[PDB]
Write a protein that binds this DNA or RNA. Structure first.
Ligand code: MG
Ligand code: MG
Lengths: 96, 346, 56, 113
DNA sequence: CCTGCATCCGTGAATCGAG
DNA sequence: TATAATGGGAGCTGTCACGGATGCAGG
């Protein structure tokens, strides 16, 4: 909304539009740097005001929310590599 | 299907006690408590430990757990060692074991019998923040307290003494569990006293009272300021899932920004400040800049006294304070000329 | 011995729910039924399609 | 349109599109033949039946008396060939003529709308 | 005892705005 | 801590059409 100085909603239909086009990095932008990725957007803004190109987008925060909300449902959700070895997207903050 | 109706059916199975039956049960309970006392006098063991052992054998093996109040861990091995230790006593002594068992059994039957009372009482306390069943179970706790604290010698009907403990447990529960932000019971009584006060005044004045008017009717120690403070405390939180609009597509928490996490502007400014400060500290030597980096805590994150910096660089503390004066003064001249750090003054 | 199979036609809805990627399946419809049968079987999502990678 | 009466709009055809995409069986269903054969007819006032008789086997199809017929008496029809006027069961067509005929039927019938 | 039909319960039901 | 008190209370009724599981009588 304008009142809250908010951004425009990029619905799943607008996602379809980008997908149908095949614009992957524009869609990845909306899904990360331009919205939900925290480290990525801070480094992005910093890059633009420094004249440097935008950084590689990190994993979205909203997916981390999904992971922990699924853990609250007592369902284990693990991100893996091709070796089927667990990958920590929380970077050690969720493990003891 | 319906939890309330189901519990009401489970309650209707147990018949209500006759005066004789009720006195009998209370008698066996009290004599049972004395039996546990006497068994403690003989055995030389903890009355609580003995009580839990007797309670275990009466209830059966269906329930086996560790009791917080007891010192030893309570397990079937332990309760068998103790039960056999208790049954190693002579006729006139071992009698008390049978008395204790009979007492606990009478206690179970007594609590089971007067559950109808709790229901017909807790039904009046509904709508105060706790569900019907929550109230009933809390009244059941008070019922248990009433049974163990009852004395049948007074010829009082059990319902009379039970009701007090039941209401007490329910009221304590409502005072404790209701508010999302838990407030001490005495403070809740204060707030509710303020409610009855303000309602009395609003009923007599034909309008809602001022802070000062309530402050008057409250008595000494109460001014308008304290009344307003009390009201501010009693304020309950509101749900983030509160509906916005007549559709279901909007929530209340959607309009609330996050004040904690740094905006990209904040992080960028902080990085620019650190870079510009390092650009400023490079206009000094490495030594006189290190004195400052150790002094204000840029490096390591600790502010040091003059004695520690002097113990590191190898000079006197006055030399360090001299170097820090020269460095700060140089940074002042650098600032006066360059006009770079000025915008970061915020 | 080879497996004897018969061609099976199913609607777009049941087909989209029977997809091998549970991230796409759950993010579509009947999230409960999908998540349970996926958690039980210990299913893995190879991120083949677009939906899964969009979520990620 | 302005609200004037006319031909079937998208409102009429869309349920047919969804009916085909969801592989659903029509409320008013067209009856087809499982195997090949020749047609023999039997008609009565309160009963109507159409026999499809092959050299190896014979199949009876009992139909409502008001039903429409797409086949002449004594003709030679394929497996899964329309007899009753109406929408074809995609699964009856699948167990009969196979995947290719189903795919062709779905694509064509959807296109029609 | 096993097939078939009636019937039950649970699940869906466009997008973006503002509010 | 004590007269005695002993089975609740409000339902929301004008969507619909699907898949699938339960259960029923019927051949
Ligand atoms: Mg006063
Ligand atoms: Mg149906």
């Amino acid at each position: 909304g304008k009142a809250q100085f908010g951004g425009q909603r990029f619905g799943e239909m607008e996602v379809w539009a980008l997908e149908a086009y095949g614009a992957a990095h524009t869609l990845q932008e909306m899904l990360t740097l331009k919205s939900d990725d925290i480290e990525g957007r801070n480094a992005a803004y910093e890059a633009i005001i420094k004249g440097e190109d935008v950084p590689e987008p990190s994993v979205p925060e909203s997916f981390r929310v999904l992971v922990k909300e699924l853990q609250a449902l007592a369902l284990d959700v693990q991100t893996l590599d091709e070796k089927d070895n667990p990958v920590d997207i929380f970077e050690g903050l969720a493990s003891k | 299907s319906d939890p309330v109706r189901q519990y009401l059916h489970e309650i209707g199975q147990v018949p209500l006690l006759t005066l004789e039956e009720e006195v009998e049960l209370a008698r066996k309970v009290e004599e049972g408590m004395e039996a546990i006392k006497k068994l403690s006098e003989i055995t030389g063991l903890d009355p609580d430990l003995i009580r839990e052992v007797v309670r275990a054998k009466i209830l059966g093996s269906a329930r086996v757990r560790h009791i917080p109040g007891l010192k030893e861990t309570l397990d079937p091995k332990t309760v068998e060692e103790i039960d056999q230790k208790l049954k190693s006593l002579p006729k006139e002594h071992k009698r008390y074991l049978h008395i204790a068992r009979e007492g606990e059994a009478a206690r179970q039957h007594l609590i089971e019998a007067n559950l109808r009372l709790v229901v017909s009482i807790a039904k009046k306390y509904t709508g105060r923040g706790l569900s019907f069943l929550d109230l009933i179970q809390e009244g059941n706790q008070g019922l248990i307290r009433a049974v163990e604290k009852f004395e049948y010698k007074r010829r009082f009907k059990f319902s009379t003494y039970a009701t007090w403990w039941i209401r007490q447990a329910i009221n304590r529960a409502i005072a404790d569990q209701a508010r999302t932000i838990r407030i001490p019971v005495h403070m809740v009584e204060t707030i509710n006293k303020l409610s009855r006060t303000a309602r009395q005044l609003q009923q007599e004045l034909g309008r809602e009272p001022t802070y000062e008017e309530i402050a008057e009717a409250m008595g000494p120690g109460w001014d308008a300021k304290r009344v307003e403070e009390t009201l501010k405390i009693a304020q309950e939180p509101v749900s983030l899932e509160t509906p916005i609009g007549d559709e279901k597509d909007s929530f209340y928490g959607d309009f609330i920004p996050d004040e904690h996490l740094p905006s990209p502007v904040d992080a960028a400014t902080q990085s620019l400040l650190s870079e510009e400060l390092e650009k400023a500290l490079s206009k000094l030597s490495e030594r006189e800049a290190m004195v400052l980096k150790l002094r204000k805590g840029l490096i390591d994150g600790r502010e040091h006294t003059l004695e520690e910096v002097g113990a590191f660089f190898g000079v006197t503390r006055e030399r360090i304070r001299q170097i820090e004066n020269k460095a700060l003064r140089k940074l002042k001249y650098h600032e006066s000329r360059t006009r770079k750090l000025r915008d970061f003054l915020d | 011995t080879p497996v004897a199979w018969k061609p099976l036609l199913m609607g777009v809805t049941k087909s989209a729910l029977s997809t091998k990627s549970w991230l796409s399946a759950a993010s579509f419809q009947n999230t409960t039924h999908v998540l349970t049968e996926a958690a039980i079987a210990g299913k893995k999502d190879e991120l083949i399609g677009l939906k899964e990678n969009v979520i990620l | 349109t302005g609200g004037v009466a006319g031909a079937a709009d998208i409102t009429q055809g869309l349920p047919r599109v969804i009916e085909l995409f969801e592989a659903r069986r029509p409320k008013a269903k067209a009856v087809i033949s499982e195997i090949d054969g020749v047609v023999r007819i039997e008609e009565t006032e309160e009963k109507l039946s159409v026999f499809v008789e092959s050299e190896g086997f014979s199949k009876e199809y009992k139909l409502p008396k008001e039903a429409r017929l797409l086949v002449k008496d004594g003709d030679y029809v394929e497996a899964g060939q329309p007899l009753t006027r109406g929408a074809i069961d995609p699964h009856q067509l699948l167990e009969a003529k196979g995947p290719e005929a189903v795919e062709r039927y779905l694509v064509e019938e959807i296109q029609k709308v």
